[PDB]
Design a binder for this molecule. Structure first.
Ligand SMILES: Nc1ncnc2c1ncn2[C@@H]1O[C@H](CSCC[C@H](N)C(=O)O)[C@@H](O)[C@H]1O
Ligand code: NA
Lengths: 265, 265
């Protein structure tokens, strides 16, 4: 009579922790969602084989509206697991689901897994220097989201890096690329003209973290805006004031122009 | 010819990922460091048994000053692994170790694992709202560093949460407790008087992230400064103004007083 929130990790089914695997293998019922992120290197079938269980995939509606009707009822008489990409509580609203579990008298536990939030470390940028985070959302109809632009501005002013989560529309199999993110940003820049994101802005792209060969690229928007970074998922990062070893890493590892080695202090 | 940076995760020997465990097992040599952090829920003996490889522990100096003469040489003609607590490359200086690998003509790959940076999501606080991070350092002799205090000030002022790592003396196995951290901050508040950290400041304490039974507590300093949060390590968080949902989570899951639902939202 327990509910387990278990992260599956960044790229494939092997990104789950041993703890998460062993516990999942022994749960009576296994549920999962694949709309909060994209695990590019695996399939539902492969996950099921590893875990040795049939997995009922839930939609955003099933979860956000009927979690307490579809999942919780079972966790009252069985060991239930709810799997998610990356870490179940990072950049999702799944934390609120623990409140529902409690109000239903269902104890819940959380098994973490590698998350894109900490994986940014592979970019060479000191993780403690990241400021507020944001999401570049797809414009819809006449509505054009722009808040993520202000986040970059605020962080840049303090010299902090900015992690930009990119939009996703799983049901339509749409995964925003870093290129689309850059195009949207230049459009916002054209509107606000704050000198926040231009063709000369240095950016970093991390694609398919978790795989053995993720794409890690750094450079100016003008050079990267049309570059192919491979299949999604992707994240875009706007560095703040860099330390010398950060720039050196971006150059030696992310193929950035040696030009950035000459850091301004 | 290959070097694998593999994360060990948060608390015990089962916090490594399946991918990390399988790659570790096929390595000819396995190194590890426990000076950046300590796996409090397990032992070196237990980690060695799970991986089935003897583990050569490296000191801070072995890594920072001699990585290239201790680890890379073997990485030249064998598969070598370098284990670190948490997610690889989170520790500030680890990223440049990949540059060293390159310089030595050695290929390197990163196998992620859970990190406290993402695991703090279990506190209910939205990850995107975290700002710059810092470490609470013990004063000593004539040196009294307070930068971590300014970090909290800058984040809070912008409605951002502040993740605070607490000082640790790995070799001597001595951890700073959230209680000690709170006392130190009050003294800094007494020195600077910025109205940043007082008896009325609301804080969150996270102990033993990764465990199935972690300690998550939220409340005002005047009430938590002398509370027993259990064995280390401890993580201290000073939230900024909260989203009603964040506060409800702390109230419902971390035993925070109802008061925060109106004073800190
Ligand atoms: N492996 C990966 N590589 C690059 N970006 C990734 C990624 N996994 C997730 N993301 C990014 O994060 C967004 C989903 S946000 C949900 C994140 C998840 N809880 C975690 O812990 O990682 C994606 O749209 C993408 O921009
Ligand atoms: Na952060």
């Amino acid at each position: 009579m327990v509910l387990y929130f278990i992260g599956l990790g960044l790229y494939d089914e092997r990104d789950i922790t041993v703890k998460g695997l062993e516990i999942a293998k022994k749960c009576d019922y296994v549920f999962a969602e694949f709309y909060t992120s994209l695990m590019a290197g695996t399939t539902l079938g492969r996950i099921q084989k590893l875990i040795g269980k049939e997995i009922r995939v839930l939609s955003r509606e099933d979860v956000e509206l009927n979690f307490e009707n579809i999942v919780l009822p079972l966790a009252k008489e069985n060991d239930v697991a709810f799997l998610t990409p990356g870490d179940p509580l990072v950049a999702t609203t799944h934390a609120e689901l623990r409140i529902r579990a409690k109000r239903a008298g269902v104890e819940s536990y959380v098994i973490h897994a590698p998350s894109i939030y900490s994986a940014v470390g592979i970019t060479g940028l000191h993780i403690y220097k990241f400021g507020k985070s944001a999401t570049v959302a797809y414009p819809e109809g006449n509505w054009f989201p722009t808040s993520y632009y202000d986040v970059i501005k605020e962080n840049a002013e303090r010299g902090l890096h900015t992690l930009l989560f990119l939009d996703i529309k799983a049901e339509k199999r749409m995964y925003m690329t870093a290129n689309e993110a850059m195009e949207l940003l230049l459009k916002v820049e054209d509107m606000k003209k704050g000198g926040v994101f231009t063709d000369d802005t240095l950016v970093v792209v991390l694609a398919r973290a978790g795989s053995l060969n993720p794409t890690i690229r750094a450079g100016y928007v003008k050079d990267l805006i049309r570059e192919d970074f491979g299949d999604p998922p992707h994240i875009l990062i706007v560095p703040g004031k860099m330390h010398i070893v950060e720039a050196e890493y971006l150059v030696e590892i992310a193929g950035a122009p040696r030009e950035i080695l000459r850091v301004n202090v």
